[PDB]
């Protein structure tokens, strides 16, 4: 009845994430996710071609929550684009630490999903995603410079890589050793340590 | 006889090729033995399970940097901060240049799952990071003492920040080599990371 297909998909997705978190992506099959989703076998192949399409869905969903701050950080009309970036990072960290779903998915993508020459689509998927994410980050920086919020001579793309790298690295750290990083208690410091890298670093300028 | 030393080297060498090509999850020791041209008896002599083999590749990264790391960790070293810079340049150089080191980092980052069906994997990376962390913090506490980093700089946090950034950049470079002239701009990349520690108000107490 249409709501069926929609809820069945979410039912697959939510079970892909249980399976993947437990067994890793490499040895979990579509068929195993279907049996776990309590979904008639053949169903899973209507909603997802391979396992990679299913991992990509998990990764795309991570973007939903942050679309608004992200899209604001990227709008030239935006008044406080570095202000939106800041609140974006805050939120990314808050969700990471607060949201079981979000954390599970990051743990899957960071620590439970091999890139194989076998399943080439996985790596490629990640590449395209990190590249999209990079375009986004570079824009917002470009906006923050234009508004006089970042150094005028900042290298927008290098500062983006720098920034993504520190955020991506911190997330992985916290996922591996949670109790070494008060990610939530000290968010502001963590977000600011990084934004501090972007507006105060001489290396990062041209 | 220490001919054990050669066959062991050919197992490890073969484990890199197989884990790299096929990932850890579905590569068996019997798979690696074949590739290594050794017997399953031999491989299982040297390695009880894959988790020891992976641990082997992991452990091997440290060797090259031992001197430069011990240097920055020495309270008696005058330029602890310059040792850490030179150590990071070295870390980045080896990654770009050394097929081996690249393949191993690639295996660790992109090709090796933490599955509690193999919990030693995760537990063994936790240990190397917590160790690596005490080594970074010492390098920092020292450099703060020699008037190289702020006096009020939260050392343990700086250390996490430093590590995240490096780890983050290495992983970005493996995923997308052509967006990080890791080797041509290494100094810039290393210094972007120092600048953060030395210049960033947020990292202070």
Number of domains observed in the structure of chain B: 1
3-state secondary structure of B63: helix
Q: Is any Cβ of chain B less than 8 angstroms from the Cβ of A165?
A: yes
CB B202 within 8 A of CB A199: no
The answer to whether the Cβ–Cβ distance between A127 and B188 falls below 8 Å is no
Name which of A26, A111, A189 is nearest B202 (Cβ-Cβ): A189
Given CA atoms B80, B83, B89, B93 in this order, what sign does their dihedral have?
negative
CB A134 within 8 A of CB A162: no
The answer to whether the Cβ–Cβ distance between B176 and A127 falls below 8 Å is yes
DSSP secondary structure of A79-147: S-HHHHHHHHHHHHHHHHHH-HHHHHHHHHHHHS----STTHHHHHHHHHHHHHHHHHHHHHHHHHHHT
Q: Is any Cβ of chain B less than 8 angstroms from the Cβ of A179?
A: no
Instruction: For residues A10 and B38, give the distance between their C-alpha atoms in angstroms, rounded to a whole number.
Output: 48
Per-residue b or e along B161-192, where b marks 16 or more CB atoms closer than 10 Å to that residue's CB: bbbbbbbbbbbbbbbeeebbebeeebebbbbb
Domain of residue B64, CATH code? 1.10.357.10
Residue B116: list chain A partners with CB under 8 A: 22
- Smallest CA–CA distance from B196 into chain A, residue: A197
Residue B132: list chain A partners with CB under 8 A: none
The answer to whether the Cβ–Cβ distance between B25 and A22 falls below 8 Å is no
CB B136 within 8 A of CB B162: yes
How far is the alpha carbon of A117 from chain B, nearest alpha carbon, in Å? 6
Tell me the residue range of the domain where A34 lies: 1-206
Q: Closest by alpha carbon to A203, among A151, A168, A166?
A: A151
Q: Is any Cβ of chain A less than 8 angstroms from the Cβ of B119?
A: no
Residue B191: list chain A partners with CB under 8 A: 201-203
The angle subtended at Cα B20 by Cα B15 and Cα B22, nearest 5°, is 90
The helix or strand, by DSSP H or E, that contains position B88, with its residue range, turns out to be helix B80-97
- List all residues 6 or more positions away from A133 whose beta carbon is below 8 Å from its beta carbon: A164
CB B199 within 8 A of CB A200: yes
CB B183 within 8 A of CB B148: no
> Can you read off the two tokens belonging to residue B52?
């020891």
Given CA atoms A51, A52, A55, A56 in this order, what sign does their dihedral have?
negative
> Can you read off the two tokens belonging to residue B50?
């894959």
How far is the alpha carbon of A171 from chain B, nearest alpha carbon, in Å? 8
DSSP β-bridge partners for residue B204: B153
Q: Closest by alpha carbon to B90, among B71, B108, B76, B107?
A: B71
CB B194 within 8 A of CB A200: no
Q: Closest by alpha carbon to B73, among B139, B137, B129?
A: B139
Residue A197: list chain B partners with CB under 8 A: 165, 192, 195-196, 200
The answer to whether the Cβ–Cβ distance between B23 and A177 falls below 8 Å is no
> Can you read off the two tokens belonging to residue B34?
């074949």
The answer to whether the Cβ–Cβ distance between A161 and B167 falls below 8 Å is no
The answer to whether the Cβ–Cβ distance between B126 and A177 falls below 8 Å is yes
Q: Which of A27, A131, A183, A203 to mutate to test the interface with B (most CBs of B within 10 A)?
A: A203
Tell me the CA distances in angstroms from B79 to A56, A70, A81, B69, B189, one per residue in order.
47, 42, 40, 12, 20
By CB atoms closer than 10 A (0-12, 13-18, 19+), residue B132 is middle
Resolution for this experimental structure (Å): 2.2
CB A86 within 8 A of CB A191: yes
């Amino acid at each position: 009845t249409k709501e069926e297909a929609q809820e069945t998909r979410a039912q697959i997705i939510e079970a892909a994430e249980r399976a993947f978190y437990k067994r890793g992506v490499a040895r979990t099959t579509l068929a195993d996710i279907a049996e776990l989703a309590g979904v008639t076998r053949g169903a899973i192949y209507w909603h997802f071609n391979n396992k990679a399409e299913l991992v990509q869905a998990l990764l795309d969903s991570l973007a939903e929550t942050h679309d608004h701050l992200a899209r604001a950080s990227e709008s030239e009309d935006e008044v406080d684009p570095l202000g939106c970036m800041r609140k974006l990072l805050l939120q990314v960290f808050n969700e990471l630490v607060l949201d079981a779903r979000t954390r599970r998915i990051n743990e899957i993508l960071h620590h439970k999903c091999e890139f194989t020459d076998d399943m080439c689509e996985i790596r490629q998927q990640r590449q395209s995603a990190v590249l999209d994410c990079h375009k986004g980050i570079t824009l917002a920086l470009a906006n923050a410079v234009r508004r006089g919020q970042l150094p005028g001579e900042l290298d927008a793309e290098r500062a983006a890589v720098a920034m993504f790298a520190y955020v991506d690295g911190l997330i992985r750290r916290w996922l591996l050793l949670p109790d070494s990083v008060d990610l939530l208690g000290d968010v502001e410091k963590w977000v600011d340590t990084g934004l501090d890298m972007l507006r105060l670093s001489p290396a990062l300028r041209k």
